[PDB]
């Protein structure tokens, strides 16, 4: 009789998405009386990337919350969200992500059995390295971890480095082995799965983004009992301001502690830095252009107001 949801994600607890998968099973516990019962499995202890939606498709898991940058084998639209230097900052994405065009790509995989419920917010991106990243011309050469994304590859690559796309839970032994010797991510991201011990120079770029789009199962979704749903629905909504909040804090808290371990240091771009940086990243937009269309490109643009 209880429907079960197996909630799956790639990262430690103590983060924005850990933290809202924790709650989510808390308030359905609290609040549907036994009717649904959630079962939360951080750290890719159940499902890694890639390998969390082959098992969402065949019904193996019910929810995920998947960044942004992953669905490129299912569309081509939420490619948007990783243009380098596109959002100014989370405030723009989030006005993105309220956009009718914004809300509507929630739905942009719902024919290939893929539902979205809300946006998840995490942070802007920042880059490591252990060298020195001051101009753009410090990335050549360099081997960067990226999230499995054509336009992150890309980013890399306009800035003459080679480009290394690995699952999350790989990161730090990709780093600690010298598979790669760079990445970007969050500072929660980074503190969380300790990468500082591993990454001597961070540079604070905010060049980009991690946020994520909590899906499930299409059939699975489609079929639960209506009160059951919108009540579920309605959690997940309060779930997301709670995200939110958190992860605002949750990044600030980790850069201090990456600040204070005194193993690695962390430069901040001047806003000219980060214009040069910008102009050497921009033109892999052009290689997209296409694939997200002219309107989207205009919304995203004007989130910035
Ligand atoms: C974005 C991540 C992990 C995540 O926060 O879900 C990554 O860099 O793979």
Do not use: C
């Amino acid at each position: 009789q209880p429907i079960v949801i197996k909630f799956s994600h790639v990262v430690a607890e103590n983060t924005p998405k850990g933290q809202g998968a924790l709650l989510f099973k808390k308030l359905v516990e609290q609040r549907l009386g036994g009717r649904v019962e959630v079962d939360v499995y951080p750290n890719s202890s159940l499902f890694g990337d890639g390998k969390e939606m082959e098992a969402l498709l065949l019904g193996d898991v019910q929810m995920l919350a998947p960044s942004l940058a992953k669905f490129e084998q299912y569309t081509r639209k939420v490619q948007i969200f990783d243009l380098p230097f596109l959002f100014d900052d989370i405030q723009a994405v989030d006005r993105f992500q309220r956009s009718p065009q914004g809300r509507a790509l929630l739905t942009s995989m719902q024919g290939k059995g893929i539902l979205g419920l809300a946006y998840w917010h995490n942070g802007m991106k920042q880059l490591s390295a252990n060298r020195p990243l001051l101009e753009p011309e410090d990335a050549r050469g360099l081997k960067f971890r990226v999230q499995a994304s054509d336009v992150l590859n890309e980013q890399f690559r306009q800035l003459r480095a080679i480009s290394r796309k690995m699952s999350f839970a790989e990161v730090y032994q990709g780093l600690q082995t010298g598979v790669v010797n760079g990445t970007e991510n969050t500072w929660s991201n980074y503190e969380s799965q300790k990468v500082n011990e591993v990454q001597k120079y961070f540079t604070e770029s905010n060049h980009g983004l991690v946020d994520y789009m909590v899906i499930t199962n299409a059939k699975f979704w489609n079929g639960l009992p209506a009160d059951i749903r919108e009540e579920l629905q309605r959690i997940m909504d309060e779930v997301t301001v709670q995200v939110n909040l958190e992860a605002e804090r949750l990044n600030r808290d980790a850069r201090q502690r990456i600040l204070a371990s005194g193993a690695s240091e962390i430069h901040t771009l001047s806003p000219q830095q980060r214009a040069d940086w910008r102009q050497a990243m921009q033109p892999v937009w052009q290689k997209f252009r296409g694939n997200v269309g002219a309107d989207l490109l205009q919304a995203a643009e004007a989130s910035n107001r």
